[model samples]
Target: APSFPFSRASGPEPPAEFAKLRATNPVSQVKLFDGSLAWLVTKHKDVCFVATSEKLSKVRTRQGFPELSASGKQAAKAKPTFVDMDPPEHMHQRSMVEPTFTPEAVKNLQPYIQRTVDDLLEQMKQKGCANGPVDLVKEFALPVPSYIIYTLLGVPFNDLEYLTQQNAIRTNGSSTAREASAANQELLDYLAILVEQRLVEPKDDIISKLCTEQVKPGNIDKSDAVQIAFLLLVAGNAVMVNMIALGVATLAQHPDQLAQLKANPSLAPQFVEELCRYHTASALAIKRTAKEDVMIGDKLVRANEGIIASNQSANRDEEVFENPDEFNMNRKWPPQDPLGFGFGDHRCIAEHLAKAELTTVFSTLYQKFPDLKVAVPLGKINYTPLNRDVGIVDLPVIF
Candidate 1:
């Protein structure tokens, strides 16, 4: 059988296959693009179990590990980052840079994040002063995370566009292996240069922090530093960029909820949480291969079989939330239940930063454009092609 991609258009609704699989057989074998078979875990508990389970390992070098796309396959061949490794090594690598993204660290960035949002929104106001349609994705959504990540990683503002383009090419499923490899090499080279610069002149940024604390102390190699920087640059910015764009578009479609947000700005955090649960952006984040036969729910997932934990499907499981499909802003969730940021040790390193970015962006956005609306009909708005991340390629909006 052909493998399921679980593709979806840019809307709040999840793919139909998700609900079907969750209801019927939550752990079923599905064919992969590379002519391999893998277990797809869909139910809330099952997805969490697979994601956080000790039996499943994240080592992409393992045989029969599921590859979602050609680009993904090419990426798996590269030097594995902390996200791709397992156990003590993963913990050590992640720990080296973890302090910079702690709750306290992210809170320190709040004022700067707010200032960036203000500047971008101000730019939009100036550029589209005549009530003209502004591309919220390019003008606002993309730049927010890009700028923040660049600043944090010690990349220059001038190089933002180049970095963004390379990250896009690297992630886009449609890109050929040659194109993806070229983009990856280009970014890696750029990061290598940045690492060398940091070696000589340490600055108050992530790259420098890693160089001084980890690399100089003989904790990690120079190549490892480059890879770490590369992962942070690509993963850090890419996920939130889509999340912000999708959140805005989703809210625009539901004015009542938007109004509720406008009436009580304090609910911005909850709104962001719901959006994260509603549209878990990264499709390939949860892939793992079993080390031994393990019972995931009722099914016995055999050793060496690939397991994919679908966070988006888990978020919409009927057993978890009341009216899972409908966007209810005030609905309180189970404590620390949403797997949007993911679950367990390999969970998102920048989860705090992501939340701050989303909450700040949404709160400030609605507050400024209380009358904000989608300029075109839902059908006409462009979205990233199916089977890719959920994002508005060009969100035309007017206040």
Candidate 2:
């Protein structure tokens, strides 16, 4: 049996192992890092079923919950956030900030997203690139989301570098658990101060809104508000930045797809939807425990067993996506709900905002710098492993 998170042949490709698993054993047990055997569900149908099933749980504290890292285990004992909670509690906590992420709200955010995208592209044009190449990961991909998220969270943009450094330590696979935890602790401490300040003198951002409606009203604790902020800030940075970098990288690999988007700006959302489906950056985020026996496909996942649903694998299922390996901007009309942002109850709450950011970024980048191209050899590009958040680590580009 292959180990979980099977290795890939290249940065943009899934492991050849995934194809065999999806064919022979779509739901099969695989050994994990801690020497535990967990059910790894491949195939789109099984992945969707597992994501939606009431029998499965997101509770990190659950004995059988799947965790691949020491920091993950440490997180189980830490404060609860909606991401790791089940049912009503998750819904309750999510509702507090869900309105901010709704389609209407995101529509209003388009101008800011567009402005941010344009501003970053302008900086890239004027600042360097003429001298040589700029690391797209740093100058463009990282700042786009950090700016939007910082504005929304009421955190000062100047603190972005500090948070980025801390997050790099926390998420880098090489960091020790204690090092990761320390980084996170500093992050929370920083956010907690902001939360406390907002509780007293509110600003016009999500943190202040949380303080006003949830904390000041005695609805949720100050600590909970801080945890919520941490969740949004970290996720916004991690997922958004990765997808942006990977999206550009994938576009580089398929000039035709990039041309399609650049030719027609109206096709951007379609391009973004396909980009999410194609790359599936949040590869390691969805793992669960079987709280009750569940029948996925013909396989019986027994209670107390661990389950890992690969959105990366799910999106590539040939039954659903034709030429599943190719990067095609035009998939089909009416669009499919590829589990890119996830599926079921735990689906990304900020999908609309994420799409808005991505579409704006991608469309703006190519439009502004049509000649922009990846500056490094393909072999030198680094991608985090399959077991990790899957994305391009560094993308240097020259126009």
**Weakest 10 consecutive residues of candidate 1 by summed lDDT:** 4-13
The TM-score that candidate 2 achieves is: 0.94
Report residue 187 deviation for candidate 2 (angstroms).
2.1
Give candidate 2 regions above 4 Å deviation: 161-165, 172-182, 333-336
lDDT of 1: 0.84
lDDT of 2 by residue, 29-79 (tens): 888777888889888888888888888899987888888876568768977
Clashing pairs in 2: none
Per-candidate local distance difference test:
0.84, 0.83
How displaced is residue 325 in candidate 1, in Å? 0.3
Model 1's TM-score against the true structure: 0.94
Tens-digit lDDT string for candidate 1 (238-301): 6787898888887877888888898988889999988888887876689899999999888888
